């Protein structure tokens, strides 16, 4: 193996912030200067440090509640939500000491299938879901019935619509090629006289046969459309509290650890369903050489005869199958190497309805949740969170990773980077393969910092993995340099 294992390096510490007026604390942090890769040391030694202070400054942190303050969670429920026979506080506190219970839901009701997943934030730069940011177990007044098929559902307060938009693309290509060539060239020669004589032969073949198959099947099934309300969202307890812990002063660390727990954005609108994708590539070759000769001479005489015969064959085949959404038996029977029968497809699509994946998303950045009805100093938290979001996007984008071999895709998983391999190579760098060459796709290096003013510039070099090596593939798809106005 050509490897050197590379250790993670965090920076030297920031200077401390001055002590916060309302957290009574101070903060310091490091930037990841190099991610751990190829089995270097696991690092993650605490990326933030925090200390207490004496406080010499005023604070106004109590945003009041015309509602009822829930005993454990601190949520402000509207006073009409008490004694409805339902948990609106998160920890049941709204339903204590009620002289009667006034149910609105006359009937039993389901939550829409998977509606809680969409209540959590996404780290948009890795498409990973993170912690809960919205409370889809909160209904306010609720209890207007919705039906998908014959099942009745209760709409969450935060959800503007969840509805069964229901669509299916299937796409199929089967491309096949065959090419064969045969060459033969025979010869015979003779002489005699009354003494002398000669006889000679040559016979030959060259042959080749070649075949290729590319097959690609994709089903994009959609089974629901989701949109969140644009305003007045009831947030989740665990997020609401970490946002209340954020400093008024800008420390990057304490805002970064919000993103590492609850992500960077929230899902405002989404397309729900399943992907089935199958793609087969096969290449096949056969090759031959034959060469035969005799030479015979007489006057006393001599004979020589030779035969040479060669056959070569190869086949190489790669298949990838990818399934999203559904139930585990349908998932595995589609995961299997052989194209489905329509019965499995039917049962998979039927199960995708009850456990959809997310096909398409409209985000909003997470600071758009930090509204003054829930948080004091909200505008300074927003402005901090905006700046942290730009700095964090420059940390968690995988451009920092060293290049994989074998066309591996590097993904920065934490403070550590994993080369996800294509089919047909193994080992931590994707080095272990039988293949003489495989197309390297070009990989971008990280984008250089904003220079000067009157229109700043940023630059990129396609250098992190240079595109051409070992019969290279496509050079990178994005803007190779970029500019934006001070004002």
């Amino acid at each position: 193996v050509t490897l050197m294992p590379i250790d993670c390096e965090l920076s030297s510490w920031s200077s401390w912030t001055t002590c916060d007026p309302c957290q009574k604390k101070r903060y310091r942090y490091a930037y990841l200067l190099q991610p751990s890769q190829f089995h270097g040391e696991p690092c993650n030694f605490s990326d933030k440090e925090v200390e207490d202070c004496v406080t010499n400054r005023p604070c106004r942190s109590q945003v009041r509640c015309e509602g009822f303050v829930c005993a454990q969670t601190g949520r402000c429920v509207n006073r009409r939500l008490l004694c409805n026979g339902d948990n609106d506080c998160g920890d049941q506190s709204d339903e204590a000491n009620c002289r009667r219970i006034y149910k609105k839901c006359q009937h039993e009701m389901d939550q829409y299938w998977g509606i809680g997943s969409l209540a959590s934030g996404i780290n948009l730069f890795t498409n990973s879901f993170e912690g809960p940011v919205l409370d889809h177990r909160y209904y306010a007044g609720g209890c207007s019935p919705h039906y998908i098929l014959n099942t009745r559902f209760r709409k969450p307060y935060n959800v503007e619509s969840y509805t069964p938009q229901t669509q299916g693309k299937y796409e199929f290509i089967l491309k096949e090629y065959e090419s064969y060539s045969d060459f033969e060239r025979n010869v015979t020669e003779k002489m005699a006289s009354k003494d002398r004589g000669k006889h000679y032969i040559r016979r030959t073949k060259r042959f080749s046969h070649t075949k290729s198959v590319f097959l690609h099947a994709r089903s994009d099934l959609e089974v629901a459309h989701y949109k969140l309300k644009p305003r007045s969202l009831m947030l989740h307890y665990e997020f609401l509290q970490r946002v209340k812990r954020l400093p008024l002063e800008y420390s990057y660390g304490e805002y970064r650890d919000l993103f590492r727990d609850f992500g960077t954005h929230y899902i405002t609108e989404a397309v729900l369903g399943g992907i089935y994708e199958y793609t087969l590539v096969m290449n096949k070759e056969a090759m031959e050489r034959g060469d035969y000769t005799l030479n015979n001479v007489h006057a006393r005489g001599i004979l020589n005869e030779i035969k040479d015969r060669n056959k070569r064959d190869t086949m190489v085949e790669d298949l990838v199958v990818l399934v999203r959404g559904g139930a585990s038996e349908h998932i595995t029977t589609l995961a299997y190497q052989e194209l489905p029968t329509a019965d499995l497809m039917q049962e998979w699509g039927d199960a995708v309805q009850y456990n959809p994946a997310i096909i398409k998303v409209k985000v909003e950045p997470l600071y758009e949740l930090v509204t003054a009805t829930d948080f004091a100093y909200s505008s300074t938290v927003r402005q901090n969170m905006k700046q942290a979001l730009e700095e964090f996007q420059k940390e968690v984008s995988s451009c920092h990773c060293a290049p994989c071999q074998g066309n591996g895709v590097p993904v920065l998983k934490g403070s550590r980077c994993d080369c996800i391999c294509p089919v047909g190579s193994q080992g931590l760098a994707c080095e272990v393969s039988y293949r003489k060459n495989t197309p390297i796709d070009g990989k971008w290096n990280c984008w250089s910092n904003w220079s000067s003013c009157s229109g700043r510039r940023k630059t990129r070099q396609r250098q992190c993995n240079n595109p051409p090596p070992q019969n290279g593939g496509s050079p990178c798809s994005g803007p190779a340099s970029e500019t934006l106005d001070c004002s």
Partner: protein, 484 residues
């Protein structure tokens, strides 16, 4: 071929007794693995750690003092008062439900699939699960629920003739120590197959009026296939702040001295693991390999006269087939054959028995930082100091070379080379020819060098042997340096 050299177990002599603690009535002492018993050799009766009774002069600490709030009478946990009488058993004694949120109905839903395995510590030297680090069943006053993506399960009703899906296990309760658990259904499968064949046939004849005739045939065939399939039933992330430790880890952490004492800290690393899971992926994995080599060679030579003939033929087949997750039955079935029967049935069993696919983990000392207990900095630095030694002393790299690609492990004081084929030892083979492909794997750390104020070193070798025959070299960090 290689040859073994047996060695029996040795431990170093006892450390002097650690002085009698105020609340445990206990003393501790330890020893070190001066040499673990290698492939050939007797086990020590002795282990690394010893504990003894002792009365002590002072009075044990008052249990009323934690957080200005409730703490349980016979165990570790200190609780926010709204957990007392919540209707749920928040500590081992149940004292947080004695003399009575309130009356929680949330136990209508069972705990999340695999809430246990993610709560256990893990050991990087042995790959074993440890005791509970997190409390797998602490709910912290929360009534929080995950939708089961797999709840769909058929039932007949014989009265009024209907076939209908059960409406059972639709939700699971999430433990407080889990930030998110997500029931996302994925599959990915990747399959590569490569075949290469060569056959060559040759003749040569000369006659002069002496005769010579030569005939050759050669054949080679190679087949490879690899299949990898993974199915996620769920993905999880454990909380990074306000962690509620298991009562056992909590009590064992109270029981740690504030001073450094390698024995009691090494015992906590043994008992609660080197690491704890921060996040991981749940469901099932199938992996399969076939590697097949065949060859066939024949040759004849005749001249005048005398005749000689030779033939050689070969076939070597490796199948590795490993199923993680599912029912014990269908895991054996899918290990034995691959089909739309075995994949479909295996996935039906992943509905009920998921297993951890891959996960992320951090060193056990990094838990203390994030606990509900407040600062424990002295214990954390001791717990790091011990772990930085434990990962040297108990390390499988101290076992023998395991020639022909065997896997070393240390358990107790004792080595196992899990040799992949042939009878165990340093050397391992009796079936294979002496031509076999095998790696070099690490010959372990030196102690730190004598040092200048700014120069100190540590070194390795790739193995005691070089890589065997033609074979792979190690990942290449041969030398390392330290702060002296």
């Amino acid at each position: 071929a290689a040859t073994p050299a047996a060695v029996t177990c040795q431990l170093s002599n006892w450390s002097e007794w650690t002085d009698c603690f105020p609340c445990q009535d206990k003393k501790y002492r330890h020893r070190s693995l001066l040499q673990p018993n290698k492939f050939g050799g007797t086990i020590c009766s002795g282990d690394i750690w010893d504990q003894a009774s002792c009365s002590s002069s002072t009075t044990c600490v008052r249990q009323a003092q934690c957080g200005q709030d409730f703490q349980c009478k016979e165990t570790g946990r200190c609780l926010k008062r709204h957990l007392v009488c919540n209707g749920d058993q928040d500590c081992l004694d149940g004292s947080d439900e004695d003399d009575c949120a309130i009356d929680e109905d949330c136990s209508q839903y069972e705990p999340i699939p695999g809430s246990q395995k993610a709560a256990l510590g893990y050991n990087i030297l042995t790959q074993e699960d440890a005791q509970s680090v997190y409390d797998a069943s602490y709910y912290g006053g929360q009534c929080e629920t995950v939708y089961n993506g797999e709840w769909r399960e058929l039932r007949y009703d014989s009265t009024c003739e209907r076939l209908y899906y059960g409406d059972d296990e639709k939700y699971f309760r999430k433990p407080y120590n889990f930030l998110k658990y997500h029931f996302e259904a994925l599959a990915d499968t990747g399959i590569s197959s490569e075949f290469y064949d060569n056959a060559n046939d040759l003749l040569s004849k000369v006659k002069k009026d002496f005769l010579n005739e030569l005939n050759k045939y050669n054949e080679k065939k190679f087949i490879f296939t690899r299949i990898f399939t993974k199915v996620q039933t769920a993905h999880f992330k454990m909380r990074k702040d306000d962690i509620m430790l298991d009562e056992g880890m909590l009590q064992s952490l109270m029981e740690l001295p504030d001073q450094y004492n390698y024995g009691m800290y090494a015992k906590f690393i043994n008992d609660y693991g080197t690491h704890y899971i921060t996040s991981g992926s749940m469901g099932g994995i199938y992996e399969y390999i076939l590697v097949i080599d065949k060859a066939k060679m024949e040759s004849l030579g005749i001249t005048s006269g005398k005749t000689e003939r030779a033939r050689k033929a070969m076939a070597v087949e490796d199948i590795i087939s490993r199923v993680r997750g599912g029912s014990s039955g269908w895991s054996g079935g899918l290990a034995q054959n691959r089909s739309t029967i075995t994949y479909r049935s295996w996935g039906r069993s992943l509905k009920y028995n998921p297993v951890v696919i891959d996960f992320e983990m951090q060193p056990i000392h990094e838990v203390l930082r994030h606990t509900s207990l407040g600062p424990l900095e002295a214990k954390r630095q001791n717990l790091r100091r011990a772990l930085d030694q434990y990962l040297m002393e108990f390390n499988a790299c101290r076992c023998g070379p395991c020639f022909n690609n065997g896997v070393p492990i240390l358990e107790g004081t004792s080595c196992r080379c899990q040799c992949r084929l042939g009878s165990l030892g340093a050397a391992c083979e009796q079936t294979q020819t002496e031509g076999a492909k095998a790696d070099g794997s690490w010959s372990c750390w030196s102690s730190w060098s004598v040092c200048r104020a700014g120069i100190q070193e540590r070194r390795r070798e790739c193995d005691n042997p070089a890589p065997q025959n033609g074979g792979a070299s190690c990942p290449g960090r041969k030398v390392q340096t330290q702060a002296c």
